[PDB]
């Protein structure tokens, strides 16, 4: 170290040992932290926070884990920022990621302790990438123009994403609700427009998908309770103290009789805005914003159910559902479309009261009731529906397949093998190491079944050399199987975002040979 | 046995008596602490609905599924 | 059989931590089940006292 100090008190420079040391150990330590939590047999944990309140949750999602630990390592954070953002993109694939990230660092600390450039590594992982990107390319499967095979094609999707979630508990029941919910969407991608109502009490196998739609709000005092064959009217307007007439204006008289005559002329425009609206034709009125209680008994007069305070949610999912528009001034009933359902009445589920729509026109939105006998249990099963909704909205999307069970990686490790071994120089054995990470993602996963994982990656390896392009784990015996037959079907999509996203970050974090940190903003004690 | 003891009575003896007369017919011998011993329950008019043990125990093992499934802890922010 | 050596041992712990919580919990709530068990009396820190017999209250 120089004698001179070019720095200030409390900063901090790490060179290239050191830097590489502290960068390795923070991505190995960030991978086998959540390495435990893949595979049809993979546990989960719980998390409690010391800051906020003592709040407690219990999850398998490697998103959700990473978002909520405090690392500090620099190198750690890359990772959670990759894994975020793969939640954000495709919203499954996060702990294989960040897996392979891991690996692929833990074989590059090895290669420079063999003393070979960084850039040499680079290039060869580079290689290593688009040949297996490639071989990837050329496995798809693209279904869709036969209806039957593209349903069975969906329920296999759904299945295996839900094997390694609690939800696994009663996979073939859930499994019917992730299905059908997506296909009332008619191909919108608004996953929005689905509704996930949890609330305590009951079992996990009582939930349901409605064949209507519930709100949780209440109607007004003196109304119908319930209608056959409803004519809705959907609006956003004011109805509390309407008359913000936005100007400036005030009122400046000389006699308190001019005051009551005012006071008439302000309830009288209410009465004409309220008959105006009575005279679309309707016997339904929801509205997102409060309705105050003169225009309540207007209505309630004349036999007309009011809703009041259904946010824009429940406006635009309501519009959805029954057809109608998102009225307001009401000076024209031609122009305007009304929302039509066969009956509108009133549901008691647990210890609360839902309004309830059936025989609706469209059904283009949904929602979907989850029991369950403990907070954390909801709250699990909420975060798994989301990724089983989430990659089979990807997948009707766009609509070619892969399998799963270890296939993807063992061809991708095939292709890069047969690439390596056709190169000459260092970049090789480069490459070599990039089939040994991909073949550790199996490895893994029969590590959490307690297998013999050795003996049965040997095989796979053996039976994907000879030509035998649709072999896997069958972990229910734990054997090798045809993923075909056993029906184990991912996306192409999501195998490409885990591929790319992990190489692009590995490489990135290699690159760096210096570490330099500035002086931290002191929390003022006191 | 919980129930033997609170009332002061010997829980070895009660719970195998009331097995030994669940195991020979008559499926409604019960605790009678009026009594002190074992006998008939509804001949004491005590009686309960059946949703409370049905969700009791399906809520009980639900639980235990759900604890089962654990291997770690993690402190966070 | 043979091999499958399980190198961790930190879940068996977890797991055996939480098996004493809960039965810890259950022994402390035991006494008050039946007609001949007792109640609890509840001093907040705050300073409020309540006096049940009821599970969930307790
Ligand atoms: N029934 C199954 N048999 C074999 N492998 C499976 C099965 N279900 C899922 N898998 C594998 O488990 C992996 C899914 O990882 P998972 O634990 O769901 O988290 P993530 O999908 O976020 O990585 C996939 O690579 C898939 O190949
Ligand atoms: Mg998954």
Redesign the pocket.
Known sequence: LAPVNIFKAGADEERAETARLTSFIGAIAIGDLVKS????K?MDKILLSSGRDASLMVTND?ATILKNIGVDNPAAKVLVDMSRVQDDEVG?????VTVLAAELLREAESLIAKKIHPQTIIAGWREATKAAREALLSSAVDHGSDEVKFRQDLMNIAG??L??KLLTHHKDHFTKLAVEAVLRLKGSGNLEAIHIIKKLGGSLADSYLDEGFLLDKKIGVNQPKRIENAKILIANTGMDTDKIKIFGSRVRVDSTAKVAEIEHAEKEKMKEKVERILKHGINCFINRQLIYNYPEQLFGAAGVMAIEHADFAGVERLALVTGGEIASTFDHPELVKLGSCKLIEEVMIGEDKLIHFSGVALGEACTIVLRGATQQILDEAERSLHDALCVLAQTVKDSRTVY???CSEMLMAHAVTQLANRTPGKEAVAMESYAKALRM?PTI?ADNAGYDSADLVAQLRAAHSEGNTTA??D?REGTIGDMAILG?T?SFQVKRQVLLSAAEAAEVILRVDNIIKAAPRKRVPD | STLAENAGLNPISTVTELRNRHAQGEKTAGINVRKGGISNILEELVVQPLLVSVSALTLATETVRSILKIDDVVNTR | GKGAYQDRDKPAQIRFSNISAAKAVADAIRTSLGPKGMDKMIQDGKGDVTITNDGATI
């Open positions: 939590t893949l595979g049809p993979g490697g499954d694939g996060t702990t294989s295996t994403t094997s390694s799963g069970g270890g993602l996963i896997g784990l972990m184990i991912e």
